[PDB]
């Protein structure tokens, strides 16, 4: 339930936050934040940012309280010199000794009740102000308080967004008055409760709403179905330990008067933050102004300016530069000659800084990319992956003229940089990852890959034979020759061979629907509809079409140029375009023949390297599973060791049947999957499929806890953070329909796996770029988690050292190398 950044302390019409679990949150995350001396400041940093985010909505005042539980030296350290003490480790109580003074300096009050827990204090102050006439809002991070949501009591946070009381009836479906019984059968972190079983794929995560009809665990009921009643009477003294969540009593003896804000002491406020090196982010209280009507200027000194350009087509390599401008101090610097203006500039700074550098490298000019507003908005919200969308949302427009577009890049920097300075996790991703990567992608598009012009023509007649054979197969059946592919003439054959049933909840009735997913469910019976869907997969390449590789070759260089977008994706990968090599059918005899066309120069060789099971390695690092890290530390196979601990057989007695069943779960865990989806891929039944997911969690305990931690930090957070700090704004994780919520959860635990795996590649490409310039090698492609280079034996060993030793992880990374003349000779 809600939360993302620490903070705390109620007051009428203001936030009602808690400061217990919010100190434990920022210690297990954002660990890469330290000073130049050697003082930790990874949790002390969340004070001047969170309380600032809430001050835009504002209210009256804020008070201050501490914890008083049995294990608290780390939690209640926010007032050690005041009152309160208990026992816990020595590594954290030194950091909170810096915030206790900054409390009374902003004009905030204080309160402390020793003996009673912090969770009991919030329940008392919520119901007391309701009777007086004040507006309150419960607010918390830990999954304990949500039952107190009623009239006049709302949901918000200084951390993130807003939720209503009707929004509680959406995903959950339960009422507030009975929400105390929700967490009494779930589990999650801090609460010891092991036992979910299964029965009907619901387990305990999707069963919750059925328990409302006759509780069973608390008062009445004797007999019922398994898993819904079997795990209550079996587990003794386990449910009697789960009542710590229910310990949120509203009847505690406390007076405390609600008063307004005090005078802020700004003389010492800035004195404490400078010793922490964060005394510069105090200029966030100002307002912003930006119009598209700017001034003009000629050519005198335009160093460090924001450029803008006009092209003939969206592809930089073939396009002609029609106009070029610059912006410094709110003035537009127009040019009479486009090709001459490229030599007067130091660096391409502004919108689409990568795409302009590619135009310069063709003419013979080394232009480096600097700052770009496209990458600034990408880190704050992944929905803004357009030069148009960043302008229209934040205040501005995107025209066809270069003079107005150059002046836009100056303003889109002023507004987005202010929001990025308060984010240290995104500044690391902008200085060390994004900006220097723009210099790498610019060279892969400018140089390109050489193709074998004698193979593509021969393949054009080879595949043509496979087409004519399957075309003659449908002509042999049904009798009369007709016009295929056309929806109007396909129904005429279905008139002769009657067989048209329903599909499901996926929208029907229209004319667009009779070309999307029609006949895809009918293949399980008739062979006539199978030789048209197997044909839909045999004849694709560039989906029916075949984009000519020898004709798309530049008349100047002689190589194919592929555009790599740095933003695009949601996870954090580099999506290609012209040609889109991101989605190629692998391990298939069709997609393997397309790679044979991609060769190197007359004396150069292709060195293709691929990340061997990185998506399974990252799963172990973010969880901390002692059994999953064990497989990689030794250097064994993951698909074999999983099936060993599940069935109870040794690693050598594992046959191809059990290794297959384990492979489907190891690839399914990336997006979660379900027992219904697992039953369709394998020959295993519905009731037997549930046991295969349980044996996976019995062998790997911390992995189950991680899914519960991501479901926590997702439905409540709004986004899903990675190891480095990437965002993913999705409010879909709290929906009414079963089809919208399930699709949202599938995207929750999919970004910290596929995104970090892509970020380790992004950070590797930056460190490998200086080493390629001296060795005489170059970078070419980036598909999925594979990097293709062109040099050969000396570079293969150097590239392996950079990719593996990119960041110190808990698991040992392994990369598979491959040297050859072509992409098929190198394989992975």
């Amino acid at each position, epitope marked *: 339930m809600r939360g993302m950044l620490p903070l705390f302390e109620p007051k009428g019409r203001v936030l009602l936050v808690d400061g217990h679990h919010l100190a434990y949150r920022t210690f297990h995350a954002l660990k890469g934040l330290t000073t130049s001396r050697g003082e930790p400041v990874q949790a002390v940093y969340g004070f001047a940012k969170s309380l600032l985010k809430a001050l835009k909505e504002d209210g009256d005042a804020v008070i201050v309280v501490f914890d008083a539980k049995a294990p608290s030296f780390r939690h209640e350290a926010y007032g050690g010199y005041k009152a309160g003490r208990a026992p816990t480790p020595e590594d954290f109580p030194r950091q909170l000794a810096l915030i206790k003074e900054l409390v009374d300096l902003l004009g905030l009050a204080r309160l402390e009740v020793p003996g009673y827990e912090a969770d009991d204090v919030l329940a008392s102050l919520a119901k007391k102000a309701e009777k007086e006439g004040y507006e309150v809002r419960i607010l918390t991070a830990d999954k304990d308080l949500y039952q107190l949501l009623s009239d006049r009591i709302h949901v918000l946070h200084p951390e993130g967004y807003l939720i209503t009381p009707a929004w509680l009836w959406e995903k959950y479906g339960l009422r507030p008055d009975q929400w105390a019984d929700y967490r009494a059968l779930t589990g999650d972190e801090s609460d010891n409760l092991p036992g979910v079983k299964g029965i009907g794929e619901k387990t305990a995560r999707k069963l919750l709403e059925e328990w409302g009809s006759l509780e069973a665990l608390l008062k009445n009921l004797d007999r019922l179905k398994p898993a819904i009643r079997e795990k209550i009477l079996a587990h003794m003294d386990d449910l009697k330990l789960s009542w710590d969540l229910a310990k949120v009593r509203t009847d505690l003896p406390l007076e405390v008067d609600f008063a307004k804000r005090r005078e802020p002491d700004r003389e010492r406020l800035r004195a404490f933050l400078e010793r922490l090196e964060f005394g510069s982010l105090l200029h966030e209280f100002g307002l912003l102004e930006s119009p598209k009507a700017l001034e003009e200027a000629p050519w005198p000194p335009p160093e460090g300016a924001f450029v803008g350009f006009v092209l003939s087509r969206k592809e930089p390599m073939w396009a002609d530069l029609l106009a070029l401008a610059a912006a410094r101090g709110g003035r537009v610097h127009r040019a009479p000659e486009p090709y001459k203006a490229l030599r007067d500039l130091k660096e391409a700074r502004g919108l689409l800084a990568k795409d302009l550098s590619v135009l310069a490298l063709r003419e013979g000019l080394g232009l480096p990319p600097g700052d770009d507003p496209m990458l600034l908005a990408y880190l704050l919200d992944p929905s803004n992956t357009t030069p148009e969308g960043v302008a229209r949302r934040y205040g501005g427009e995107w025209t066809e003229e270069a003079g107005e577009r150059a002046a836009l890049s100056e303003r889109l920097f002023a507004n987005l940089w202010g929001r990025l300075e308060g984010e240290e996790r995104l500044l690391w991703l902008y200085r060390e990852v994004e900006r220097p990567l723009s210099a790498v992608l610019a060279h892969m598009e400018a140089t390109g890959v050489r193709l074998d012009v004698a193979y593509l023509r021969a393949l054009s007649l080879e595949v043509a034979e496979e087409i004519a054979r399957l075309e003659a197969e449908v002509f042999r059946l049904a009798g009369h020759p007709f016009n295929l592919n*056309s*929806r109007d003439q396909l129904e005429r054959v279905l008139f002769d061979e009657l067989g048209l049933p329903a599909i499901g909840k996926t929208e029907k009735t229209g004319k667009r629907s009779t070309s999307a997913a029609v006949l895809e469910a009918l293949r399980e019976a008739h062979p006539i509809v199978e030789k048209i869907l197997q044909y839909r997969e045999l004849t694709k*390449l560039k989906s029916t079409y075949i984009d000519p590789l020898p004709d798309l070759i530049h008349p100047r260089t002689g190589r194919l140029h592929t555009r790599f977008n740095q933003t695009a994706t949601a996870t954090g990968r580099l999506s290609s375009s012209d040609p889109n090599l991101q989605n190629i059918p692998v391990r298939t005899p069709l997609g393997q023949r397309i790679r044979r066309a991609f060769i190197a120069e007359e004396g150069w060789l292709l060195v293709a390297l691929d990340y061997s099971q990185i998506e399974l390695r990252v799963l172990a690092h973010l969880s901390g599973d002692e059994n999953l890290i064990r497989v990689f530390q030794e250097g064994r196979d993951i698909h074999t060791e999983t099936a060993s601990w599940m069935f109870g057989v040794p690693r050598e007695a594992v046959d191809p049947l059990m290794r297959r069943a384990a492979k489907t779960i190891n690839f399914g865990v990336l997006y979660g999957m379900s027992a219904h989806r697992l039953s369709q891929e394998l020959a295993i039944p519905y009731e037997e499929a549930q046991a295969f997911i349980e044996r996976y969690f019995q062998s790997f305990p911390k992995v189950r806890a991680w899914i519960e931690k991501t479901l926590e930090e997702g439905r409540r957070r709004g986004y899903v953070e990675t190891l480095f700090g990437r965002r993913r704004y999705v409010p879909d994780l709290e929906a009414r329909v079963k089809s919208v919520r399930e699709a949202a959860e599938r995207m929750a635990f999919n970004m910290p796996v596929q995104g970090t795996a892509a970020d380790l590649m992004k950070l590797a490409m930056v460190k490998l770029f200086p080493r390629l310039e001296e060795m005489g090698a170059r970078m070419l492609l980036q598909v999925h988690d594979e990097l293709v280079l062109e040099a050969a034996e000396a570079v293969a060993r150097l590239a392996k050292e950079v990719m593996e030793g990119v960041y110190p992880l808990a698991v040992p990374l392994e990369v598979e190398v491959g040297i050859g003349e072509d992409w098929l000779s190198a394989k992975e």
Partner: antibody, heavy 115, light 107 residues
Framework: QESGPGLVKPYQSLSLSCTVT?????????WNWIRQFPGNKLEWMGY???????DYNPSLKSRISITRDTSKNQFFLQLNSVTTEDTATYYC????????????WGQGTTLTVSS | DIQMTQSPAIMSASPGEKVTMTCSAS?????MYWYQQKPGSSPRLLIY???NLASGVPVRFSGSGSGTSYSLTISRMEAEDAATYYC?????????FGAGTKLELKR
């Protein structure tokens, strides 16, 4: 299904929306926008990917705006300063990508700009 | 932006005849897209880049063209082939479609 107004006044802002069910706008596929009629000559307006937007519209980018609402599972369209120069009859197309091609195509809806 | 023009517009053919239509551009064009649309339906695929046939498509249909002009040629006509055809490209283009070759049936 194309939902919106049947009539619009000059120099105003247009608001359209194509609803989708079953396959969400977060799994895969890019959703395009293309018009036709009366001269039977078509024109592009751009697309909208599963991740966000990623669109790169034609020379007339100062008027067209593409946005979306993932919670309701639909994508909006906003054409500012709509005049009589607009041909009209909007279709909601879709790109596949990885391997590019147009297959499906929208309904139609005949909208006219008049006073 | 390049201009797409389909020659001709309206034309009719009897079942069994040889049909031919062309799509031309202003500059050096590489590869073409071909479509089909019946009265009261959505437009779909038919023939692809330069020559070969798509997912399905009868053996009587055939493509040709390289350079400035790309054409479609049908060897055997039937009563179900009468519809409107369109052309597009994605080489040196930000993608836009043609005029429309409305093919009708002769009786």
């Amino acid at each position: 299904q194309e939902s919106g107004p049947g009539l619009v006044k000059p120099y105003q802002s247009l608001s359209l929306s194509c609803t989708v069910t079953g396959y969400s706008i977060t799994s895969d596929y890019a959703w395009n926008w293309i018009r036709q009629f009366p001269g039977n000559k078509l024109e592009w307006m751009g697309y909208i990917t599963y991740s966000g937007t990623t669109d790169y519209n034609p020379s007339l980018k100062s008027r067209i705006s593409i946005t979306r609402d993932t919670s309701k599972n639909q994508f909006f369209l906003q054409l500012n300063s709509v005049t009589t120069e607009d041909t009209a009859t909007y279709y909601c197309a879709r790109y596949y990508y990885g391997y590019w091609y147009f297959d499906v195509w929208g309904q139609g809806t005949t909208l006219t700009v008049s006073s | 932006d390049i201009q797409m023009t389909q020659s001709p517009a309206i034309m009719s053919a009897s079942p069994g005849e040889k049909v031919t239509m062309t799509c031309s551009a202003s500059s050096s064009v590489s590869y073409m897209y071909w479509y089909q649309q019946k009265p009261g339906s959505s437009p779909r695929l038919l023939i692809y880049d330069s020559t070969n046939l798509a997912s399905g498509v009868p053996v009587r249909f055939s493509g040709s063209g390289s350079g400035t002009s790309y054409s479609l040629t049908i060897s055997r006509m039937e009563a179900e082939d009468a519809a409107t055809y369109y052309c597009q490209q994605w080489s040196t283009y930000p993608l836009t479609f043609g005029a429309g070759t409305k093919l009708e049936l002769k009786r």
